[PDB]
Symmetry: D2
Amino acid sequence: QNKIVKIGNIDVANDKPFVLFGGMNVLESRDMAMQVCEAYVKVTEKLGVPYVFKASFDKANRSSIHSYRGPGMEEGLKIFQELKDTFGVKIITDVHEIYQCQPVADVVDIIQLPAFLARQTDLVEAMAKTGAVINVKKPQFLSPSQMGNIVEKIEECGNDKIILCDRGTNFGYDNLIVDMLGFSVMKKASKGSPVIFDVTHSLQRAQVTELARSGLAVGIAGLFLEAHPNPNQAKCDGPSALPLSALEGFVSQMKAIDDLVKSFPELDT
Amino acid sequence: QNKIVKIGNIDVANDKPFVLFGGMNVLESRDMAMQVCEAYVKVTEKLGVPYVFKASFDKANRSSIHSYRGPGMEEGLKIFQELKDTFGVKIITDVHEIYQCQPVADVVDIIQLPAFLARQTDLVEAMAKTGAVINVKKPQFLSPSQMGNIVEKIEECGNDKIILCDRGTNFGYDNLIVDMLGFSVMKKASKGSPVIFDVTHSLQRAQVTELARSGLAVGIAGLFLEAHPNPNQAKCDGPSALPLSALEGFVSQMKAIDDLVKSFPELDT
Amino acid sequence: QNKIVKIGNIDVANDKPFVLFGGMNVLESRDMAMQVCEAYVKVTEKLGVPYVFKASFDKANRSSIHSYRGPGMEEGLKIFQELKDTFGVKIITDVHEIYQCQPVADVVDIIQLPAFLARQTDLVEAMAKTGAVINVKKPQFLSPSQMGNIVEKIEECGNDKIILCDRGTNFGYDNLIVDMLGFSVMKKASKGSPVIFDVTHSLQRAQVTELARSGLAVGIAGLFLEAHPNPNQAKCDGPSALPLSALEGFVSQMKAIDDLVKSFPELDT
Amino acid sequence: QNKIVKIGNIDVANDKPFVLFGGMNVLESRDMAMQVCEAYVKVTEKLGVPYVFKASFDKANRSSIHSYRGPGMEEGLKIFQELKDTFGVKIITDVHEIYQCQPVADVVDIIQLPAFLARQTDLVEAMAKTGAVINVKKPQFLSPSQMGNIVEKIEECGNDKIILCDRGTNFGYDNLIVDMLGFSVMKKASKGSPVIFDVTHSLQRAQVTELARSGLAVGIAGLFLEAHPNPNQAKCDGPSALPLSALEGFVSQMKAIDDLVKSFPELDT
């Protein structure tokens, strides 16, 4: 039995129409955030796809201490409040420090637990204690069955509004493969929590569309995607970031595939 | 672009309606071969899906010298000839020894190069010289780029009718993962050879249908599938074989998803 | 050109006598710490092997929020101080939060960056600014060549006193393999930083001794080992902790192997 | 308990002095075979290390039907007979076709089962029926415990004289890692068969010596090595062949490490 996780008036579940958790890598500027959100809002309202805007306010693991890290919490939350006021969008963002959980949860709809920090017990408890909807990013080095333990850890803190997100798994050195069989393993281990597919971070690109179609073909709750007006000038490196102009075409295919797969009766197998 | 490989009146290509290379693991008996072939013929005829019947006549890697391994080539070819005479089906089977290539190619339409023998040069040359269509089984330890080498080796023998078949890739000990991004890589490395997905052997079952849909969602030339009247009573090891009863429903889903994806405008730009 | 990192009067380098970073998983009690530390000092003093006592004061990535996680920093630093006053041992411990770097570096000699937190910039910087020697635990998902980027990051903070520690690499789901060829790669990518082998965490044990000999035969700067008086009763799961009584025989083999290897003239091939 | 496999007056076993199975990739010519064999005989007789000369007579997996692939069986067996007449060496060679097993076994001391063909039941049976000692090359995609099954298959054919050879395991695409823990798994699965390490083919180099030392440090029955008088000019690519001139220094290190490790009493942990 599939669990239903509600994000305002959005219902998230493995057997309901997919939800697009879409945005950009980091809040590069107030202006680019508005432009990116507006483009996604136009595409999703037109196609009738449930939507959650995504963006990070801080980049915790950049290569240098001098690297661009995003605007920081206080400035990022101001930008999120502007997007809520302007477009009425639901928002997802990630948190890296224990003290940020509450202030961020008071503003956004979903808080994301970064893959590298997925087992940091104090952070996971602080996020669950906020009562917000939590998106767990599966570490590339974690078995899909191990997501059951994290769900239990969050649920013991009184919070059951949990979504699970795959971003591929380590395959040799410096390379990633997406295990399409892992989605049902995660569904089974979590007793039905919604599973979503982060296609952008799965691409070790020209193959974003076919990989996204392949993922939705399994029968999942949603798609996590990053885009940018001109990917090559992005402040952070988004080699697999989708050009904003390909969004309409991309989301159109995903609604078509998803609708088709969700219409299939289960096959006695 | 994409190469078109002909199997009589069937056209196999990455941008054409998928071909179902469906059958059973081994020719357990003439009676079961007839039963299985008849079921696939009924389903594929009704839905309008190109079909090639698959079965092995010998199992060359059984665990003991005393293990059941099929009827052998002489009896196996007699069975194949009856299926052709009765149903007019196209046939694919695997060959393990150089001497079998000629006699087998005179009866079937496609000869398959077993994954363990994919780099055995004399066998590759003997198979190529027959002029039959060749199905190359990608070893679970080979990279998708390396398939371009096998294509060149076969083409040096004067035969360009090559289909490539993914069956997953080793992931740790005793486990396989299917790299959905490898299909595009094989297409590129082979200058457009048709790529097919062996779903049943990629299941290191309830996941056969999802995994098959995920593979076809990528946009490929075909699917390789094994079924059995009573899977748990099969003579050899079929961890993942589909009950004959589930065929209609399975094939109906594949055709819908394949037609959908093959109709999408090239999202590229 | 091997770098030499000093820990007080100890010289750590790939071509110097190996240093034993040995202790326990966590500081279970003051009394147990004294016992374990004495066992190691006794053995290393007698055999003439450089020694650094190791133990955690907090287990930040526990199984549950309420299961044992150690004494905490306040009691842990008190226990560490007693060990120094009593034995005059050099000490290594891990830190998980930015605030802990300054108080912990005031007591211990080497601060360890936990593998899961290896790319967290703010923590790396706070540790680097303390001036303490830093042990970098290589994440199970990171390639050996990527250790060079982390060395550059710490050096940008003004600290070049870095040791690299291998604990195995993910191999399929929930399994690890140690790449003995990775030691050479880490040496070249870091421009000669000392490389040490964490044999206890590389074992997912009757094979701890042969694996440790195998690591030292490569020619490396040290070994990281955990032992316990009663491995089966440890508060924290230590399936691979060495029984304390096996220490002298274990270290005796390591010194013999290390000495032999370090005596060989380099064979350029 | 370990099995002892005899090769003439040589005893091969996991707790006996390692045996060097050393030679070249392919019998490039009679004069080079003589040159290489003399070099190994001089070094092993000087150092007192048991020796078996290795060379292939045919390369059955080259990239083209036109590629150089050795002298072939007839001329290769002639060269082996001259090496036995001249130096009195024991010989190991691989066989790739069923018909070759008996003629080759009438000339050499050990026949090797190529890794790619390790599960071809008819070739295994043909080799086993010759009564020759058999070296099983572990496939890069097979787990160590699955070697128990090949041992059983061979013993069922009436031959128990089996040696197991590790050549590393697949790690991602186009890369190999050697699992040093694999050796004791293979010993256990085979009920004590001697296990040897092929360092040459484990190198996906300047690291041949350190990796060889690492494998012998585990405590094994032998080492498999290829060398060449002028490596970058081998007729067949041999990227990891050791220059012949480095043999004495290399074998001198291996004898030292092996003698040390074999002198240690088993540590009770």
